[PDB]
Amino acid sequence: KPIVVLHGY
Amino acid sequence: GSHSMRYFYTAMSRPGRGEPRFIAVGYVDDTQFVRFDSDAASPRTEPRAPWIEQEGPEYWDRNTQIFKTNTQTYRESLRNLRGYYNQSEAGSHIIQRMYGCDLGPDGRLLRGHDQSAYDGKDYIALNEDLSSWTAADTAAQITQRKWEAARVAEQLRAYLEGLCVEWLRRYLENGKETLQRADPPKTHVTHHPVSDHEATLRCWALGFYPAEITLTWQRDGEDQTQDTELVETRPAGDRTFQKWAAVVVPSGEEQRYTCHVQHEGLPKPLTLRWEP
């Protein structure tokens, strides 16, 4: 299972 | 023995040809199990291994939600990175991210990973401590500052030590008959004359899983590393892999050469020679 959406670059 | 889970994200801009494309793939060792493509007619997370199909609707909906949001997030990120490097809106650019967890031959977390590249160049990476960052340049330093403010490293540490390992172990159990089954290489040596007094000996390894393998040629029991042509390990298309190693030998001297094969699926390492 992927990680939750993390902050953009 | 050792196992890993990896997700691979790729976002590619294409000025004049629509919005940037986002692709995500997931692997357990050398087995892909999920995919997502923003360019698909109906973008959704799709199974790519039989053992993942048993996961319920909640799993697939959550995956799709995450990747759909990532599609938007990565488009914003591409706009930002273009700005960080003073690049025009005309060129195509790529952001790649790979992350995941390694397990040893027992089950617990061995090492965590999170690395990013911009146009194929290392950009920013999570250090092994899962607490600090290594930024490649002054552009990546902006990204680092954003990520420190948003507690990204802390979120990654929590995921890599917890959910990543938990889900990897679940996949390893559900797909144990393939993922935890090492298939030994089928091996043979072929002989190809090149001239009157030289010939190529090619040592074949076929149908093996996982991809990890050692193929070496020896002359009089000595490694011929500089004189051995070794092709990249290649997928057969049926989950298994192929590789060969070739050495050019003087004619009549063939029996001085031995091929050595090391693979997890074998009960014992193999020593092979050409059999006329």
Binding site: - | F8, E232, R234
Partner: protein, 99 residues
């Protein structure tokens, strides 16, 4: 900044004339990701050729497997046509059953 694709053309199973098999073209080590790959039968583009999902290696370079079902014979020539930004002309790599 840009890396040219490595190309391998091969069969899934040991080649046997008159026996159904799979023809593979493995493209790897390239950057950027945009790539054109066709499998050829006697110079003619084969239809219904499938490919794996886009992934990348530890060095960030991309790889893809292109494949189709085929039955090899003695005289039929098979090849892989690859086009990439690093190439000025499409590259044709012939299928050698000993490779």
């Amino acid at each position: 900044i840009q890396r040219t694709p490595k190309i391998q053309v091969y069969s899934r199973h040991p080649a046997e004339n008159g026996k159904s098999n799979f023809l593979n073209c493995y493209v790897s080590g390239f950057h950027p990701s945009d790539i054109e790959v066709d499998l050829l039968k006697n110079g003619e583009r084969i239809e219904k050729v499938e490919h794996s999902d886009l992934s990348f290696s530890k060095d960030w370079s991309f790889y893809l497997l292109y494949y189709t079902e085929f039955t090899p014979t003695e005289k039929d020539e098979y090849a892989c046509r690859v086009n990439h930004v690093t190439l000025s002309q499409p590259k044709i790599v012939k299928w050698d059953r000993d490779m």
